[PDB]
Design a protein around this ligand. Structure first.
Ligand SMILES: [Mn+2]
Ligand SMILES: [Mn+2]
Ligand SMILES: [Mn+2]
Lengths: 405, 404
């Protein structure tokens, strides 16, 4: 819901347009999902689109990957409708001498819904030319690429200032920098956030970044506590776990949203969390979050089984070590996962008459034998292949390992 | 010169954007020259531009190469000025379901000067979607990509029909196909030219070897239909922009040549041009326009044995040491004339600057009848000694003996 003073912003990140392009079963999952996002922006009639990073899965995208993206952008963001937003901030900052203006302030190209985006870890600039994929879409006039970080050492963060009606919005951008280093430049107070002064209080402050939320390494993440308190809300990028619901941080005073990716780039429970995007509507200094679930997302089910401690395997396996029987018991489990995988899809698409894809099934297993009670793990490729035509991950169904090193 | 019934067309080919991108001296020659082309189209106020192919030197252009092309296209081909051309042909035949219309018949993108291009050998399609670099420029709305050849075996060639005022023009296009194969499909009459009526000016653009080293690797002019009026040759880099007439066939043939030198041979040494092609009724007018941003290049061929200047010393006397100074004097006279050409050509106008370091090439076959052998010096070393005087620092001279 929105009026002339409410700004409808659509949030999404880590689309990774290019993931599993060469996979026969799951090739189009990458771009077809992204195109759904762009159609919603036109459908929900948002005022803009904000992307968090990792738009491409590859640093140097394929021609097909770049095509599908270009195709979706032109169809959904070009039109006759006028943009109700005003560009107050300095264009010269983060807009080069090629086309110093914003794309929708361009005379020869009519942009109905402007798109802003930062570069992620995969999207990041590279090569002797030092350009990223977003610069190409920007010189195409399709996208607006802000939050450039030229010097990792010395960092100045200047805002993009936009206003709709009586509502003023300060937009902060900071693309991906290697987690281990960006951890230290913050500590040394090397980063300075630039502020408008005249209407400084009224500004709703919004920031989007692309770092590890929490790290496996002790230095490879970015702690929330290091960000300024004046900020109102933060969009977390590099994380693929859909936590679109805004938690409030006590010490800092702002809320944090973690949209997660658009498709599963890894078969872990974090990627199993149902993926959404949010219709973020900003009014005055208050925001309204309307989360919207994705339909084109491939069904994904994952479970964890410790064969030794399992309720079913305890008897047959310690005594006998009968490999062929290990299958049948495991066969029954995988078939119950596929069963629920199809039901979720069935239920979710009961709603509308738009009309199913072969689901994703993952099992992770450790087996322990104290005294030659060894479970026999079949050859990884062989077990997975037997479900050819029932799952999308024909080769990658199950993982086997032991936790003693 | 042109009125409402004269169609000004800018003709260019083999821009090879991406050539020597990684060369410290000559990295920018690739795109800055192509930008000159585009600015001319806006400057000369042509009605359209026609590219012969090989726009990119690489099949997968780097991000910088694609950016500089996209930049030149947006700046010169988008504007408020209307296009005086009308699209009569079927949009469906050459435009996909993505954007079935021509780029300047697009509602949300204002195109001032439309670009038509075929794909060359380097520019050719590859990969999953069978897409090339032109498909991206087309979906960006910057280029119209026509003359796709889906089947090399069976070839149907349908024309793009365009009309300005009382002047009607049928635009035929054929993308580059392998020279050895396309030679045989033509022989089997596998290719059919579709036809529209009026006295249409028929125009064809292709991207093949004019003459070949192999006996099967070229395309003879004598195989194409006779109704056509003019032909643009798009794979040959030698600049023969002057339209020769073919007696048997009855049409004229133009060979614009490349935009920069992809090879250091006398063919690429020929001063490079583009042509302001003015079509009125069934008559064409050609105004060739020389390129200023092209690097000075000088090449010569020296056969040491037969060379009159030195004879006795090099045969029977001690070699290696003295030979340098003799060759040194010659290469400096080439650098001398290279700089002069540039000076004379740029004297004309106040470009207000300094001139680029020229390209110098020497080729040497050295024969020795009877142990009279000249003593040659290591390729890298001799070339490197002109660091700062030439652009080609590590490859100035070619030494060889003919017989194998
Ligand atoms: Mn990431
Ligand atoms: Mn070429
Ligand atoms: Mn060629």
């Amino acid at each position: 819901t929105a009026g002339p003073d409410t700004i409808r912003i659509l949030v999404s990140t880590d689309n990774h347009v290019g993931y599993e392009e060469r996979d026969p079963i799951r090739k189009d999952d990458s771009w077809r999902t992204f195109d759904e996002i762009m159609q919603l922006a036109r459908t929900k009639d948002v005022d803009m689109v904000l992307l968090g990073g990792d738009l491409f899965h590859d640093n140097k995208p394929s021609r097909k990957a770049m095509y599908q993206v270009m195709r979706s952008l032109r169809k959904n963001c070009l039109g006759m409708k006028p943009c109700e937003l005003e560009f107050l901030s300095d264009p010269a900052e983060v807009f080069e001498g090629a086309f110093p203006h914003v794309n929708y302030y361009d005379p020869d190209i009519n942009v109905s819904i402007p798109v802003f985006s930062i570069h992620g870890n995969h999207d990041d600039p590279s090569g002797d030319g030092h350009l990223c994929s977003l610069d190409l879409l920007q010189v195409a006039g399709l996208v607006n690429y802000f939050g450039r970080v030229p010097e990792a050492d010395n960092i100045h963060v200047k805002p993009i200032l936009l206003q709709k009606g009586k509502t003023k919005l300060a937009l902060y951008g900071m693309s991906n920098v290697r987690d281990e280093r960006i951890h230290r430049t913050f500590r040394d107070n090397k980063v300075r956030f630039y502020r408008p002064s005249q209407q400084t209080g009224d500004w709703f402050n919004l920031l989007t970044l692309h770092q590890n939320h929490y790290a496996h390494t002790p230095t490879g993440y970015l702690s929330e506590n290091m960000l300024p308190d004046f900020l109102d809300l933060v969009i977390w990028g590099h994380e693929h776990e859909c936590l679109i619901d805004p938690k409030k941080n006590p010490e800092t005073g702002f809320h944090v949203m973690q949209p997660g990716s658009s498709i599963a780039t890894s078969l872990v429970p974090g990627e199993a969390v149902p993926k959404h995007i949010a219709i973020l509507s900003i009014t005055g200094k208050s925001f309204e979050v309307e989360k919207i679930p994705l339909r084109t997302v491939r069904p994904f089910v994952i479970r964890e089984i410790t064969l030794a401690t399992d309720k079913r395997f305890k008897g047959l396996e310690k005594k006998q070590d009968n490999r062929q029987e290990v299958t049948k018991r495991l066969m029954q489990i995988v078939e119950e996962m596929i069963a629920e995988a199809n039901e979720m899809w069935r239920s979710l698409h009961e709603d509308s008459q738009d009309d199913q894809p072969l689901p994703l099934i993952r099992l992770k297993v450790e087996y322990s034998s104290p005294e030659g009670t060894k479970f026999e793990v079949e050859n990884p490729q062989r077990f997975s292949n037997r479900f050819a035509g029932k799952v999308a991950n024909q080769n990658d169904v199950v993982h086997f390992y032991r936790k003693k090193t």
